[model samples]
Target chain A: PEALTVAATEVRRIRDRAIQSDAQVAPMTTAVRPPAADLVSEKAATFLVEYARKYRQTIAAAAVVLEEFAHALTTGADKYAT
Target chain B: HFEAYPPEVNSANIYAGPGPDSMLAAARAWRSLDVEMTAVQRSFNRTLLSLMDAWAGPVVMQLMEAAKPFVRWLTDLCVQLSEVERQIHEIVRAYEWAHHDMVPLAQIYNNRAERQILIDNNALGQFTAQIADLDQEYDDFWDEDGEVMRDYRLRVSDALSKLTPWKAPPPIA
Candidate 1:
């Protein structure tokens, strides 16, 4: 919905995690979901439908990706560490 | 019968003893594949990303705007694959280092920890192998001399199929 508002942190974390090695998605979610005001808005269905249609299936895949990235960053970091 | 190991609980396979080589052989095999995939991963990202950058412009879009989705999907895949490749690099690197400290990881396996690392290695290998196959499939739709004409056919066929210029669907009954 046009009124929908996600936190700056929520989506940024995904990109940040994608590019950087220091962040993890698991812990971030605790603080990242939309504020209680937007948690289950009457219009939530509109956005939820689109979101669910595309990404609901990949929630597990998303976690694995985070895990994969975190491990990779560590690998490179350790190998190159002084 | 060999029990299957899933990545979700991959830790269980940390210390496999089923193979004659006591899991070291499997570990070595995965590392070799990891090394090979590292090179392939680099090559694919380099070539495909460069190709997409050059070919995905308005110049080509002028000739075939419908080709946009195909290229965009591939571009998306490039990003996804990059992420996957990073994991592969990490896993392989970890394995490489473990090989250097073989005596310890060996002892981890030798002591027969509850988890079997070899199981995870094999599963990861299979996943990476699937990704390799995906590159070729994507290529089939765009690769020259293979199915290059397919794109043209699609665009032309779609062009004819559309109600372009004066095309309109019938109003609701």
Candidate 2:
């Protein structure tokens, strides 16, 4: 059961420990909202919005992979012990 | 051009000042984002460290191989995030420096322009000749001041343009 315990805790940590709040992410997009009026401000706003969107997408993708890996780890560990 | 000569009293005869306040706000937001990204990178590192500790100990050797792919993916994510953090730091500094340089200069110029404009407006169409060519003087001042404001705008924009969006590293096989 010791090996089983290690696997379960490991899976849980991988799945749960990297959690991020939307509030933490909100500033990424919020910085550019109500976009500035001048040409320079407008361009800056455009760049910022795109930057925020890409970062958000990258983070989401990474989280999904971690989730899948945790599940796979559980399966592998279970098969090993039996 | 005298028909439009009186212009508008509040015209100030200068292009509106750059929005230092807006730039400053954006800088603060980027500053916040840098801190948040750093926290995320640290969290990922901690999780990977925890896993390494467990996997290194007698947990099935085969399963360690199974975990290596995920380890690689996490490492890629951390590296990309660090690059993004560096870009954010650069942007914050740019916006901050632009804001700092413009604020005092803008205030001083606007005050001077407004004073000159008011004098020009008061002198409009007085049959008794004024001592100085007030209209010509205001125009000369505005021509120079307008150019200065444009230069400020261009500098900020150029600084921001140098930054490119953060692209994720190649996909994990």
Candidate 3:
């Protein structure tokens, strides 16, 4: 459980940073059509494309992690239940 | 003639309305309504909070534990979506303010054009892509053979889908 907690915290940190960066970038680029608006759009588009690709990768990675966690928990549970 | 026409101007008595008993009853009804509203509010708050706690405690914890990786991945998607939302808000605000203050014609048109472009290029596309990716990810998890993964995916996806209007398209679409 402790290990799980630590891992969860780390994961949450990653999520928070991702969200925060999004919140910052979203407002900055929204309406005022700065000279760099197109550039920003390009960058944001690129991020999303990469994000989609990485989203799949993350899912695969997470699937592995989940499998491991489930196995460990199930094993522990069985030991206690028996 | 005037004296004869004006027979008399008589003082009239006006009746006072209901007595204290009626007043007390009306007051009691008002108090009853207030108490009932308060009770309803408390009940609603208690029920909602209880549901949230139950969810966040063992159920969410287990699911989060089970789907930590997936949840983390989804959180990333949410962040990206939030960015799009922020941009939309900003554009709308600027356009509104510029229009309000009667800015120059060129400035106003420029702002309006920029707002439209943002909608066409960024907001619309980004929103669609995000939802598509979410669906794909959800499907991937749903198709998993593992019981825990499958169940957890269903529960989480059901809960999340409620928050957003993500649904399968009509046959026409």
Candidate 4:
């Protein structure tokens, strides 16, 4: 039971770290903006905006999965502890 | 604040220094983010390994096995982040090259305009020896797409093509 507790603690630690990582991602992607249209050509600007949007979407999706993974890990750890 | 800095622009045709400077800064920011993420992954790996070492039973094995998908997902995320940084760097370089080529063209146009004004105002002296060269310069500026612009476009297309498809690993069992 003692070893199991230690393992559970490690699992919780990882879950907390993953949550922190995901939090960082949100702010980073939220702050990201494509270069202005004047700085680049019309086609280039359009492509960059589209690409940035897709990139933001991809990271947001990954964050959701990260949250799910962390939740499951914490749940499993709790199950093992009990 | 990542995209706060923009290059200086004096006139419509003149792009004052700061050549792709903001893009490079943005790339560096991404690189730093990648580094932090890599550190997070390393810590997770270390902690997991330590847990596995402390518990050698079948349950521990099962838990570790179930965690593989998330681990792989984090690794993939790190890879995608690094690639984003790389693509940004490439885009900045392409912009720098295109700007380098265009600066001279801007100068030629400005000089041509000055000569045209002098001739129109009847203020021209004997400094029109190579006046014909001005027409050539104008033509070159508007001639078939310059090599640098073509290269820049191609690089942008390549960067777009290289983006990794978003795929979240299956849920941890």
lDDT tens per residue, model 1, B85-119: 23323333432332232223333243233223333
lDDT by residue for model 4 (A29-80), tens: 3343433333343444345445545655654565555556555556665777
Q: Which stretches of candidate 4 lie over 4 Å from their true place?
A: A1-82, B1-19, B103-133, B144-146
lDDT at position B5, candidate 2 = 26
RMSD of every candidate to native, in Å, equals 28.8, 7.1, 31.6, 6.6
lDDT of each: 0.30, 0.49, 0.34, 0.57
Q: Name the best candidate (by lDDT).
A: 4
User: Which model, 1 or 2, shows the larger lDDT?
Assistant: 2
lDDT of 1: 0.30
Best by DockQ: 2
Task: Summarize candidate 4's per-residue lDDT along B33-102 as a digit string, tens digits.
Answer: 6787688678768867876787667776886797798788879878887887787767666665555554
Ranking by DockQ: 2, 4, 3, 1
Model 2: per-residue Cα lDDT over B1-108, one tens digit each: 212322222123222444335444655555555555456556545654555665554544454565566566555545554454444345445444433433243444
Ranking of all candidate structures by their TM-score, best first? 4, 2, 3, 1
Q: Quote the positional error of residue A10 for candidate 4 in Å.
A: 3.9
Give the CAPRI class of candidate 4.
acceptable
RMSD of candidate 1 to the truth, in angstroms, is 28.8
TM-score of each: 0.19, 0.56, 0.23, 0.67
Minimum summed lDDT over a 10-residue window in model 1 chain B is located at: B164-173
Clashes of each: 11, 0, 0, 0
Docking class of 3: incorrect
State candidate 2's TM-score.
0.56
For all predictions in the order shown, the interface RMSD in Å is 25.8, 5.1, 27.5, 4.6
